[model samples]
Target chain A: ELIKENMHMKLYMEGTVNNHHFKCTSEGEGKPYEGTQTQRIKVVEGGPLPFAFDILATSFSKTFINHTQGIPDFWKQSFPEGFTWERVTTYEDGGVLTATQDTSLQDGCLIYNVKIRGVNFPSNGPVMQKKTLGWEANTEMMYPADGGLEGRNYMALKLVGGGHLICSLKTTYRSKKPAKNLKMPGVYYVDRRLERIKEADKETYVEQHEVAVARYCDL
Target chain B: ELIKENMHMKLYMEGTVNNHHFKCTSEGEGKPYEGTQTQRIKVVEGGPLPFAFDILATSFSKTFINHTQGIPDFWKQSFPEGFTWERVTTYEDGGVLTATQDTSLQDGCLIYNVKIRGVNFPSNGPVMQKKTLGWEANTEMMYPADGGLEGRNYMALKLVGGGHLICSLKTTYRSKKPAKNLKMPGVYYVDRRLERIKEADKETYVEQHEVAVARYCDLPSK
Candidate 1:
């Protein structure tokens, strides 16, 4: 007998609204919330087959303080206030890339999906999305911190044999603004790490990650 | 108020091991009762930084059936059986130039790691060795059905003036035998469609995915 070493695969994904749709108002006063969602796609060559991947959306329906007002001199003089992105110079061989868009104010809701190919891939995103209560993917999906992504996106792929292809449809949203008011004085930092495991006869593996966020401010 | 247009981000990642191990023992000569277990590290780039990625171990432990009996039978009657490899096309884009070694048997527990650099850099190869695994870096971490890959792995500078860097690790495992004689089918398929939600206010933007696994042979449920 002879085994044919030939094969092909194609994936098609789409998105729709959840049960919470049509019942909410958009951001601002008296405007109808026109909410939307998007999807994200990624592929790795010659690596561990992805077992499961997902995308979740959450929403905050309450009003936040308008920060357009200039802070009083007393407030400025009393606090050390500023924001900054962490800095790094060393580069590793394997790192991460993420893209996102938010739709919280348009319809007061957020939605997105992630499609991963290869082995035992589970459709747990829907379950995770349905059970979550906030507007953060991390909040809804219960993934580790710094894992929630808010955004509209798409991915394009060019195959090895030939031709071109596009993968995943991403929804677009307005840029996010930093929340107003000092929610109290605070300082913080973000750290990321990866863990590995293995054995002889059993067929189970796990990857654990840890991240830290701290805050403090000098009075 | 002036927003800082230029900022810096430095991240450091180290590999740690957790739950996952397997072993098997056969007695008397029935069917060589076998058991196995293994797991390693995996990491993917995070955030909306366009640097999406993942890494893990690529080694495992299994029995030897010999190239004559095992290799031939595997290519013949084994359900969904075969091997996959990538074509460099050019030995220079950092493709496979030579085979210092081949994928074969090892004595004790086996291990390997996969490292990815940037979002889409195409350089793949071996890195350091773990007590239980070695490392490889690539854009596509999983084996393609077509037995080839189509991307690169690398690091980029997005912070400050730009040029921050970190490495990603990945792992893989091979089955001891072709999966068969199971309680459920081994293959599945999914049918999905995308619908754009119009009126963000009045429209419902809920999405659902439907899937079903294919049936070939069935095994007694335990």
Candidate 2:
């Protein structure tokens, strides 16, 4: 019935990061009336998708959700970024999805082949605009300190079809150097652009100089 | 001749905050030629002079200093604000100084009564403008999570004359609580606007409900 009265999914936060518990959904669909509408999201509990959001809907009784960083309150900034966590394949419902910058060779590593063509905005309908929430759009970090150097910070979000998205992407890799022998411990979700190696998702491996191509996971 | 080529001070950083080992001077005087020029700075190493700056000069071969927060590099921002640490007397050399907020009751504590009248900016110049050092120019926290409850950030800067100044002020006091026991043990900078107490200045004391006022300092834990 008209894309079920312009789609609108639920559950928007359950729990996670690093230990990856997973749960988040605040969907919305085609209010433009017709000929344009789509959707895509599946962190399924991995990494990237920490926080920072801006979504606006001028109809179906107006909708707006502004979150300039996660929730737990009490200041937390100075390095914590992320993006492209995988399983995002299904374009143009309302059309537009182009955001990524981890050319990997490892600055913060982890982002295997992400280049969702530049499709800019324009869905047309009920869109009277309210444009201004928190800030930043056209995120970055193809290279940074080492990604999320200090404490907790992970970012990466994609939603298309019934669109109006502004997800501030970041992949921190700051090294105040004290990370010691540093050979990947705990949270590992690496991927050296697959060419060979998936011994059941590697679980771990990345050497350089003469062998061990690249592969990781603690999912 | 022209106030000694519009002042170009020395020393930019020495070191010390809570432990208070001080030094910082990047002075620059009235390069605007004639009718304007002045100076004031004396932390004498007490407190409030942490970081955040913007100073522009148009004639002394066009000078421009831009600092968006202290130095140590890497990344540090979220809670750290300070202003008016005392010893600023002689006013007007080119004239203009006003910025403060810490009425005290301690939220992020440490600010012994700061309120330097409100006299906005404009000293007239090579006045074409490069202005844009960064980030903030009219701060807050007359009350905030006990004032910078995270780790490092202290703001408070007042420079009277030599012209354009934009200091981003902030005093954080965010309480995620976990500051345990809470009864002045180490970094005591308490000051109940003082009425009495100076056994060489009560290095420690503060109580409510009845009396015992406040007083603090741990300058090397004294």
Candidate 3:
């Protein structure tokens, strides 16, 4: 009864980015920013019986622009030799079940792992499930670093740069019947670098980004 | 050097909740839910000087329904005595500098506290500043429980009951002139009690909720 097999499951994700400058030493100005992406995973096969699933064909794209030029002097220590930055990264992938499930123990709790293959872009590949990905429920109630009462089923993932990208999914079962569908709501703290151009002196041309994404999903 | 004083400050908050029943033991059925709220504070007074602000006046409201009645036998142990629950709470307050500021240390970091008056609802009070409210920043480069490199000014708050209600604010200063305006976007893990009724043998009722919100703010009294 510890293992459930062949249950239908679907996964979806959406994200955003917000960029801002504290004190720009350059002539350029920093503006507001935004971007998003989504994915769907239909359980074609596998589970507690060796995890695997098919990602229904999908695509995601994002663009970042930091008109800000000179790096703030106080920040010079962090980005010495100034820098300039701007970039647009995109990807399209799906079809096969490029994922696997494993388990381990952190502290005294059982940790579950689901590894999928693909670029580490917003909710595109398998790593996005890293948060609650390896987390499992245990009767010995323990508290994780996040300050929550553990022993519940949950999954989560996050990326920070010009902004932060984050997501999580938690489930409470009703019966022994295999779950036909599932959904989760998540948020992204967009922070990342879009483009960077280093100069001759200690001055750099950098495009820093920041934004927030309000997201939701159904499986 | 410790007290930043008279520096203009603004506060904001947002939250979301998700409610799902694995197996309903009661009657009727369970439906999904969502809701949100936002606020903007135009500085009327105090900041690095202390904690206080004037409100611009606004409103937000949400409603949830669970037509399901009767308890699923399996869930009996959790609610053995049976139960009944339903109700609606409301609030509307703003305008003035009803707030205070304080500080402390946690895990070897400095935590700032801002307390304001009014219903502890969404971005409605003065200390929606609660995130960094009780948060401590480390200079030695430390990582807090939330899983992130520390040093940045960030604030967060969370509440749990029928579900989970959460919010956080991250700030990047513009200069030493003292912040004239600030913005913070947050999320809400909506979870609330539905209509619940229990009978002699085994009767039960339930309802759930979920949603997230993004917010912004400005200081007018600068």
Candidate 4:
């Protein structure tokens, strides 16, 4: 096939929400928190290649100094010094990061996608945040000039009292050679005088990359 | 139109390579040093689009530590805080890789010109031209090659003998925005795409992209 339009790809992505904003319903005060999550995506089958993302892990935490004047009043009731809350969950629990793919273009590059996690929030923005918390492409998708595709979008998580929790995210998926999959903890020779690589089959990919580099840069 | 969907893809890149060579001192003798330098950027007119990258993942391994000498060293560094460049490259080629897993790629020709501060010391030296030694550069950034929209850049350095040091660094002087300075590049609709291959090409490349101006819709997913 001159153009292999139908290509299978495995996407390995890491999503992060830097300074996720939220409000203390009563205290009426809010600050940003940081969190991270990972996703393994597979394009099973659909009209537009509808797929599901397996969120492997999501970790988030927020911290504040403990002081009568430094911290919020809510914290004084809970702890006297300082306060911090961290949770580890995936798509099942209250994790904020998620992943989705749309073949409307091509596959995407490993560059990135700005993302946010969690479903509990307020009003909408230029993009929509779903119950499961994944946004689709309307206009801002970054198409690869070579092959594949990627998109980076943002949403304003509206507060009922009328504020915003700015949630941002990113996702990067690369095109892999079909037939089978590359094993985890994959091995490659650092090319120090012919040392044996653990996953022997990985050499094919390592060599393939070397050839790709040489050909592209005329090395 | 208020929104821009078409513009010639022009790239601006400046690359620098420091003493990329091998030397032999012969004997069980060895010495290591470190240095810091900003990317001396200059670009070629009528290239691809302008883009920058951040080094996210890096990997380096010396086959053996003391094949000849008794020591080998590697350095990790960042740029000075207030050092800003007047020239900023936006979404011309690929887009920006945000802070967390910040990484970029192109092919071979990978050089190490990073953003490091005064803390990047040669064991405690503040000289502006001071550079520490490195064994490899595993930074990843992209360039739009015809066959694929992506490529990676990194290198390996080997010490063959007491004095023989082999360095492999793909090259480019890549600059990018700090997470604080980055904003969404654009609003995109997936209905159409922009690819430059496979044709006599078009009178205006924008036609091939088939940009169908879209209105923002929030189809609430319950």
Q: In candidate 3 chain A, what residue range of length 10 has the lowest lDDT sum?
A: A134-143
Model 4: per-residue Cα lDDT at residue B5: 22
lDDT per residue for candidate 4 within B1-222, as digits (tens), equals 111121111112222112111111100111112111112122222222111111111210011111112211111111121111111111111211211111222231112222211111122221112221222222222222211122122222212221111211122222242434322212211111112122121111111111111122222111
Please give me the DockQ of candidate 3 compared with the native complex.
0.02
Worst window of 10 by summed lDDT in candidate 4 chain A? A207-216
For each candidate, give the interface RMSD after superposing the true interface residues on Cα. 19.5, 23.7, 18.1, 19.8
What fraction of correct interface contacts does each candidate retain?
0.00, 0.00, 0.00, 0.00
lDDT by residue (tens digit), candidate 2, B1-222: 212233332213333322324443322233322213222233334333322112211001101111112211100121133221211111122223332222121242222233332222333321112222221111111211232221111111223332222222122233222334122121111111101111111111111010111112111110
For candidate 4, give the docking quality class from DockQ: incorrect
Error of 2 at B14 (Å): 16
RMSD of each: 24.5, 24.6, 25.4, 25.4
Q: TM-scores across all candidates?
A: 0.22, 0.20, 0.18, 0.19
- The C-alpha stretches of model 3 lying farther than 4 A from their native spots are A1-101, A104-114, A117-219, B1-156, B160-163, B177-222
lDDT of 3 by residue, A1-219 (tens): 111111111222221211111111211212212221122222222211111111111110111111122211111111112111111212222212222323222332222224333233334333232221111111111112122121111111122222222221111112112222212112112122121222222122222212212121110
* TM-score of structure candidate 1: 0.22
Model 3 lDDT at residue B192: 21
| lDDT (tens digit, per residue) of candidate 1 on A130-156 | 221111011000001121111111222
Mark the 10 consecutive residues where model 4 chain B has the least summed lDDT. Answer: B23-32
Which regions of candidate 4 deviate over 4 angstroms?
A: A1-153, A159-167, A171-219, B1-192, B195-209, B213-220
